[PDB]
Amino acid sequence: MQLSSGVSEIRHTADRWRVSLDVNHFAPDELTVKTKDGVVEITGKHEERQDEHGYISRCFTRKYTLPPGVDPTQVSSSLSPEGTLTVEAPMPKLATQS
Amino acid sequence: MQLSSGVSEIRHTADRWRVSLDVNHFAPDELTVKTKDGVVEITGKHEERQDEHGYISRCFTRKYTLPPGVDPTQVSSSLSPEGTLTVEAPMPKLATQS
């Protein structure tokens, strides 16, 4: 920015943030990622699961409402069987509240 | 009170069973205990959390279908703010089903 001399190149690969969500370990396939105009939510729920002390199923919801401008067009998400949901992308370095 | 205690049916045959459904820690009031003919279910869902790492919420569901091991009339439940749900009571000592 401005200091073109600090980049020289017209195109560069920087300005990237990496936030992570952890839950799909309970559901790798029964997980749903939906980007809602800046609202980042991960849907994860399972049906009647067996357990040591009974039958237990739960639904998990984590909602990230980032108004500062977590760009919806440029925010993608990686998910590994570990239930590691990485949301990596370029975004407004506002880092305000939650 | 004394009641029509015509006889002293004092039978302390109360070994008593004791199982716990600890989860309401995430829900003291948002918890609903339901005993349905041997079916013990604990209804509990959290409320949109507000944390710097995300606004999260979940729902817990445990279904203990114990026909020949849990009585519907004499089963009570203890709950403490700590979200500890003890189900204590005298139960029909049955042997398998059929």
From Swiss-Prot, chains A, B:
What's the domain of life for this entry?
Eukaryota
Q: Which compartments is it annotated to reside in?
A: Cytoplasm; Nucleus; Cytoplasm, Cytoskeleton, Spindle
What changing S57F does, per the record, is: In CMT2F and HMND3; decreased homodimerization; increased client proteins binding; increased function in chaperone-mediated protein folding; alters CDK5-mediated phosphorylation of neurofilament proteins; alters CDK5-mediated phosphorylation of neurofilament proteins and indirectly impairs their anterograde axonal transport
- Organ and tissue specificity: Detected in all tissues tested: skeletal muscle, heart, aorta, large intestine, small intestine, stomach, esophagus, bladder, adrenal gland, thyroid, pancreas, testis, adipose tissue, kidney, liver, spleen, cerebral cortex, blood serum and cerebrospinal fluid. Highest levels are found in the heart and in tissues composed of striated and smooth muscle.
* PTM remark: Phosphorylated upon exposure to protein kinase C activators and heat shock. Phosphorylation by MAPKAPK2 and MAPKAPK3 in response to stress dissociates HSPB1 from large small heat-shock protein (sHsps) oligomers and impairs its chaperone activity and ability to protect against oxidative stress effectively. Phosphorylation by MAPKAPK5 in response to PKA stimulation induces F-actin rearrangement.
The modified positions for Phosphoserine read S4, S5, S8, S20, S98
Give the consequence of mutating L21M. In HMND3; decreased homooligomerization; decreased heterooligomerization with HSPB6; no effect on phosphorylation by MAPKAPK2; decreased function in chaperone-mediated protein folding
- Enumerate the residue ranges of region (Interaction with TGFB1I1): 2-98
Task performed by this protein:
Small heat shock protein which functions as a molecular chaperone probably maintaining denatured proteins in a folding-competent state. Plays a role in stress resistance and actin organization. Through its molecular chaperone activity may regulate numerous biological processes including the phosphorylation and the axonal transport of neurofilament proteins.
The Swiss-Prot or TrEMBL record describes its family as follows: Belongs to the small heat shock protein (HSP20) family.
Subunit structure as annotated in this protein's UniProt entry: Homooligomer. Homodimer; becomes monomeric upon activation. Heterooligomer; with HSPB6. Associates with alpha- and beta-tubulin. Interacts with TGFB1I1. Interacts with CRYAB. Interacts with HSPB8. Interacts with HSPBAP1.
Its recorded name reads Heat shock protein beta-1
Which organism's genome codes for this protein?
Answer: Homo sapiens
Q: Which residues of the full protein are shown?
A: 80 to 176 of 205
